[PDB]
């Protein structure tokens, strides 16, 4: 016998569609993900004409269409950006629109261009749509997938909510955020020429000139071979070269491009060899339904569905930079997606009245006191206060968990042979609350601000006024929720090198109140938000106007989880027999199920307990 | 054996016609979906002339018809939009007849080339009409679309309603609203310029010689092989190539274009290249009838047709954009999909009395307290009430629900072992009404107006004024329906930067007052519509004129389902049996269908009950 | 074994003639609908030259001609409109022979060249007829056709006429007024240019030059490759080119034309591509005879013969616009089909003196009040009167339905288990008799006239003044017969922005008596008729002299069925039998065919019971 592809192949010798839908996709990164829908071979179907084996529950609609250019488009600013390769996917009605495709490498290399060089964008583009491929609504999940939703299934059920939030987030690791439900199979011939935007502002009689001639050059491109053999119609041409900046040939499909191969023969190249130039889909906790997951009840696949679409939700939030993004003005924030609406700030100078942080220990006392390295006063006051030109504002209050060790051993011999140790060894968890509180200029008054540094950095973040995990000269660090260390000097001469201005704190709970004269959480205005560390699902964010921590390169996206799985309450047992004779025989029964056994001189029985809260 | 397609494509050795009617289309986007009716091959029927595999329920017309145009044809508007390839199924006579197709990738990227270049289109093609592909009348439903079907069946059965009009909705997503009779088989070759609008204002003889000049050049474009071997007739012709603006070629089926293979070698490559040219159709209720689905009963297959062409009628009403659609006029309105009739406003600046909410509980008392989050007090008055120079007007009356929770736990043991534990957890529903009233100026003598916004977000939605989720600088919101936020300032000074001027709230069932001096729910008058949320069905718009609103980019359709499945009360039980011993036995008999079963020493029986409504 | 065409291909290996008759044929829209005759391929049949098998109940005739044209034809006027490919088929005598073929799409395409360009049509064919192929008189009936008369023929046996009647209109949707009885099969190659009126009125010698010149150009378009090495032969070809408007080239069957094919090579590629070049036929009910119909009753095919010739007279009336159709006239009516002969009005203006509705209920009482949302009284009057300058005129007279629901439930238990609950649902129809009236200004002398607007719009149409449902600014509708909301305002400052020329009221029983000083049902004279909605088969129609409801685009036929069938009074069950107890066995005999049955704890029967009429 013989099953799968492989009998289709040789049962009709013809290939297979190599642009399937069903799969996950990153709808941030536009990159697709592993398979979410089952793909069987079990009828042998063909696409209509007769030249692709596809899967059963997958339909073909035969849209043999050339799209020709003679122009081109132009693109004078990154935020309303077409992806030309997931157009359809990533223009979604939603939250997140303005977020989606903003950490693909074909927008991350488009923004680095107008901003670099202050250029705008042409684009033209000879695309070639042969087949729409779409699913059938009745198709059924994925033999992996599948199993996935179930884990997380399991842990709903035995109330394990830290542990069901965790396998939610790895499901968007390995799956995406979409499921694409169509492609569009075919190839595309891509010109990106990046001008200088002086060339533009002209007129508009102008831009029907510096249009039609890209789609001029490209066709010079094509057909003529690098030489200059060129058609050039007029000075305009040459003036276009001029004020060209970067110039890239993008082949999506068919053939590699080479300058010189001709339309004609591009295009017969595009057979077997298409790929998804376009792509439709929807959200991954669409998909966890009760019709998908039969097996399972009601209420309990939407719960499933509820704790995935957080995590998506979870995942667009924390890649999410709002700023200026207008280049032209001063306070310009790089490494920013969304429009801030505040380009024009005052500079207002602040101050700075330090941190301090409480600790109420819950559990645990007298083994590791949680309440001494996790407790920081205000260096102003001495005290857990402001001082008198200052108020407090509570930033978050969460639980802290460290674990602690026991170890206990006794011997005992019976007959003087057979000496028996028994070496237990106890885990538990010690709990504690802390609540971290930041003083704000309330009385409008002060002599002297205090503390002139508002930089930070985690045990897994870097300060960048040092580029390590140190303070810089002449300045001694505040303790913050867990791993924050604040660098602080009111030295006001050797502090004054790195003194940055200060914005101020806020999280996903509460706002800074350095904007209204609740709060906004905003900024304050003219500041670059930037974050610190997540304290277990919440961004602490702070706020700056150096410039030197706008700048660099555009960050990857920061990828799930979020979260790390909760620590447990063990134990640990070690039982040793050791017979200290010959002439002295045993006989050992392990369990209910096992045998009896002849012993050994030693046995070193384990044994490992856990429980789960 | 051998059965399907491939035992007639062995026997023959002959393709298949690939453009089938019988599957669905969407009407507002032209995308076509999944397969209505059923397709067999049983019978190896082909075509007449003996060259297609076609199925057995679908006959053929032969109609082997070329059409060749040396003219253009100008369309100087995108009111009167040409579909060119589903012209036939989007013209017929209906309710919303205006707005299908609008959004079709075709559709809007015509429109915004018009728009942004203030221009007008032509057209020059060459059409090649092969087959004419009908239904057979005697024609029976989809094993996929029959089960669907069934499903609606079953839940207006039961009378639930609420989880009928969900189900309807998703068949519109996945079969579309319309469902095709006849394809057009056969390839064509389109030409599309796109030329300024003060090129066509010279005379009506003027207009014979653009138009002549437009096919002349497609006729050189398929022939010159994209050199400047033309036969440019006139100066006419150089004149045409200057106020051309975007000039786009386009093959639908057939062999790919390129510029410079013939008509003669174009029309070669048509053979086994064919796609739908044109369709035709009847809306997807028409095909529920007691014929089509005879094994339910006459009043039932009615029901289901009705909660169908409901669905369908749904999704057309909240695709609907009034507007002013005239491009010269100064309120002009950037995505508006119909022409409003009112293109010429007074600007008349209005008073904004203030929203405020009622609630009622209706059950779940001492337990959600529903009434206490979901009240809203106008801040002008501090009352349920608007002020003096004020009257209210209400909007919308709904029920709002929200789930509480209990967990009862007792244990219980029984001979000193055989422990146990049940933990019951209910889940229900508390209810509660609200009422939204609005405050409009109806004493026409204010001194000063009072909160100077009128701009919203939901908690799905973004304020413009923000690009967020948050109020504007020195601005409250005010809560309403359920997740309307609306964002007031009354201060005159720090609130008139953001002030926009409002126009009014209107609904499904009401209209607003500004109109007249009941009510008409269409505009004041140079504002333009932009919707707020939905209410379970029912949609609220606002009016405002500020520009930020309009402009942008075209908006994608809003796909269904546009409710969620409502909320059941339920019940989760948990016991545990624990043996605290060895020598103790235990069987179970699970149920009357098990048989008695050896048992363990924890067992954890689970059960899950859910009652609807 | 093996059966049908394919036996006769494979013995004789030639194809099937693709051009048969005994198809269905729509005469309004010249398109060609589902198979009436039967197609049988037992005898192996093939013409007499041997080249093509054909059915066994069709005989061809060779006759092997071919026309050439040396000249043109010139069509000055769209009214006596050449078909060109149905021409013997829509020439037949009959009453409606003035509306065959005027919903083609080759009508209407050159329609709207005539009356934009203000042209002449001329067309020059090479036409090609290979065969004609016609019906042997003693065939019998499609096994697809038969069943649909047999399902109108089981509702004339019953006494259902409105269901009968409905079903005679899906008759004609799916197989169309006419059957084909012989076609003529071959190829066509035909010119079609469009010339400036303006360029023939010259005199009776030029109109020779201009018909000539015509067949040149054809003659070098086919043999001179597009190229400019046409044999030109006088300026008078030269000035032909500069007054032609629009030149279509169009091949029908054979080889697709491409400019350079020449006579000789385009007529070898006509064997084996043939396609109907010219029709002739029968109507619908000339097949529904007793002798096509053996297995029925005499007088009761006379039944179905006669409720199928009412359904195709109903949908030629229903597609016939008569008014005003010389373009010359100013009161041009576009979208016009009969020449109504009245060209030249004398532009009275008339008084509206408002509508008015009575309604009388007939059964069905203190449950609906039909007689209450169906009820208008005259706003001149506030009575069911016209005004003391006015009199009544009768409308229209019908029945109006609507269903009503009683729910009764009552439950029992018998020796405290087995609790019954039975649920009755019961659904009736109630009806009312409404009585439209309409007054008329015959009293000559009014002071004013009275509601200055006359547009209408329904619950499935649209007001032309709104481009919507609603009214304009400052109108308030008046209700009628069913759905009809006609606006009204006489304010007489306000409302004359928006006030229309009001014509008058007419129906398919009832005539305006506003053009005699019975009726005519005809027109004023200068207005232009306009359709409202249609009344359970008549059609309600009003006349008005905008100019803004006569132009536009040509509408589409409308399609039937043009009625609904009627509501049904109905009765539906829900018996629940629940078990409260184990130790309860139950058994169930659910019918006489039925065995008995052992039960279950719930059951649930369900019954649907309806009564016709
Ligand atoms: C960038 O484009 C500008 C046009 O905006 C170029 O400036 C023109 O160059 C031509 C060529 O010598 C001159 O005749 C014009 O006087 C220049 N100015 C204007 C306003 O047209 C400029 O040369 C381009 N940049 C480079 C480096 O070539
Ligand atoms: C757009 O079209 C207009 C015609 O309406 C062009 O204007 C004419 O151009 C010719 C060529 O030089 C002149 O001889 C005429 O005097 C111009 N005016 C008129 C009223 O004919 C115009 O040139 C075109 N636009 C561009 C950018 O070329
Ligand atoms: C449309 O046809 C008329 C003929 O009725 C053309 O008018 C003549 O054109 C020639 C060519 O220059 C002149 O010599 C004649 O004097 C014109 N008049 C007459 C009465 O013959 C007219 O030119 C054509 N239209 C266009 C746009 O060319
Ligand atoms: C699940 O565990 C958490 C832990 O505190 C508790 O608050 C909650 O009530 C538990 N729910 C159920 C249904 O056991
Ligand atoms: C269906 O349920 C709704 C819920 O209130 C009720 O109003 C209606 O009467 C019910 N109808 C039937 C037939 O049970
Ligand atoms: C058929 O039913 C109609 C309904 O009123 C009645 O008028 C007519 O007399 C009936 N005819 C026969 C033959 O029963």
Redesign the interface.
Known sequence: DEVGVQKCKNALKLPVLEVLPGGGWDNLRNVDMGRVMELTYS????????QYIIPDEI?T???????????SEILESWA?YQSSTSYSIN?????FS?VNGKFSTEFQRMKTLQVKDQAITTRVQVR?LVY?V?I???LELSSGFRKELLDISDRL?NNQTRMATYLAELLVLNYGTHVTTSVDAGAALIQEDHLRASFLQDSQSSR?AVT?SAGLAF?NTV?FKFEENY?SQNVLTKSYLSNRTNSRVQSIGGVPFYPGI???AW?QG?TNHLVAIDRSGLPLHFFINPNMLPDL????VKKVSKTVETAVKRYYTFNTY?GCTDLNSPNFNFQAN????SCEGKMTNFSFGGVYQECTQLSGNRDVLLCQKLEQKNPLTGDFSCPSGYSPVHLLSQIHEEGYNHLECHRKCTLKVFCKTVCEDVFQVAKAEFRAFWCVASSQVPENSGLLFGGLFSSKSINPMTNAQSCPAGYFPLRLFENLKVCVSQDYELGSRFAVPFGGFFSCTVGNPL??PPS???CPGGFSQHPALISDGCQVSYCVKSGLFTGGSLPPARLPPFTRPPLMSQAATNTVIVTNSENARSWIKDSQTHQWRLGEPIELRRAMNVIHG
Not at 43 to 50: I, K, S, V
Not at 61 to 71: D, H, V, W, Y
Not at 338 to 341: A, E, F, L, Q, V
């Open positions: 009828n042998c179907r063909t696409t209509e004409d007769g339909f609609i035969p849209q043999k269409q050339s799209n020709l250019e003679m122009n309303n223009t979604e009605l939603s939250l303005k070639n729409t779409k059938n609504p009745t059920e029907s039609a066709q057909n058609t001709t339309l004609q295009q595009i009840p009601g209420p309990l709002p969304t429009d801030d609406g904007v209204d906004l959480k905003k």
